[PDB]
């Protein structure tokens, strides 16, 4: 069984006010943290590490933290793209040109024979998510089929594990469209704050579950 | 004007912790159920939305769709003459007969009570989208946040989320439209729910914002 996982990232702001440092340096941790996560993934055999990046609505922000976030979660591929695959989608066209030019430029320089992907998804938002396929094939085709649908949703496969630190219980505009059966971490530990025993006990929790799919075991 | 969405959950594993049969653990399911939409109505929620099956679920044996399908129904049965009931979900892989039932029970609801009890059935996000653009595909000229929100499966944004039954996954019941729906997840069996258990997760619910 080709297990993947999804880490959806927050908790930088209240870990700067909680240290009493800056947001900058706050996401500089988050890099290294995300660094530390990224190499923890490819060690556990995860196909593929998902990071969801950012919801649509972020890029309403000041320039100022759009630039910073951005920038910070741009550094890990900067770091790290020389040894594995990466990739990214989402709702592209409201991410500034210069973090699209930036990434296209890293994928284009990783390693797309890796067995390990890094998939930054950005602007997640189901509604407009779903808005754009419908408008992409409004009227041209008889009728959305499955195989179309998750051709062309942002995450490219089901998820199988989704892992969220910071204390918060929802899915925000993080959710998977194509994952139904996606299994679900919260732990109130701040993402800065994870360790490598944190994540491995994720793991046996989410490990441990039983996976139905809907039905009864036979 | 608060709403709540329960995700059932634990029938089989009730029914194998009390040593009874599958059918009388979602009798005990119809009782509890039942409670459950006079608690939610005592606290105010103006609609309760309650996540009866996914498309996954009908590709069980004929048995326990009916049963659960049964269930479910037998809950309108009891509570149809005193609030206002709806559906909505992928109705075309529910069977005709629950169908039919439950369109009847829906027209002699008390369509001007103040609180709703809402099922969705045959919940999944990819064939609720597929189903939306196959509907107003060519009869329109964009697809809008406004025409999204009034077709999806839940016609509003939920605000809590409750799972009991110690699984924290969706299980295909994610409202697609609400981006700020909180979740409360609890280990504790659907039908070993109290209404302290409900009431102590709508402090948990309440106490985040
Ligand atoms: C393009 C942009 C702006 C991306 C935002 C990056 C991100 C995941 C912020 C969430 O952390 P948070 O600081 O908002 O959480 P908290 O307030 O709890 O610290
Ligand atoms: C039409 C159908 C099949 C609806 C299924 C409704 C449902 C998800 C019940 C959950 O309890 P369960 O039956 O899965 O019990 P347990 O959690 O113990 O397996
Ligand atoms: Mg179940």
């Known amino acids: ?58 890029y309403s922000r000041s320039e100022e933290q759009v630039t910073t976030a951005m920038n910070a979660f741009t550094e890990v591929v900067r770091r790290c793209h020389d040894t594995l695959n990466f990739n990214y989608s989402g709702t592209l066209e409201v991410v500034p040109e210069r973090w699209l030019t930036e990434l296209e430029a890293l994928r284009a320089k990783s390693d797309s024979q890796s067995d ?44 199988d594990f989704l892992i969220r630190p910071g204390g918060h219980v929802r899915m925000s505009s993080f959710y998977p469209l194509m994952s139904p059966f996606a299994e679900m971490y919260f732990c109130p530990t701040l993402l800065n704050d994870m360790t490598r025993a944190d994540f491995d006990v994720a793991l046996e929790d989410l490990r441990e579950r039983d996976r139905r799919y809907g039905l009864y075991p036979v």
């Open 1 to 58: 069984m080709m297990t993947n996982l999804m880490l959806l990232p927050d908790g930088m702001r209240r870990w700067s006010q909680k240290q009493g440092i800056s947001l900058d340096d706050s996401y500089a941790a988050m890099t290294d943290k995300l660094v530390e996560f990224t190499g923890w993934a490819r060690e556990e055999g995860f196909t593929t590490f998902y990071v969801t990046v950012s919801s649509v609505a972020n």
């Open 116 to 159: 390990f992907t890094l998939h930054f998804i950005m602007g997640m938002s189901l509604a407009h998510e779903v808005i754009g396929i419908f408008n992409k094939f409004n009227g041209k085709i008889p009728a959305l089929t499955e195989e179309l649908l998750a051709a062309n949703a942002y995450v490219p496969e089901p998820v």
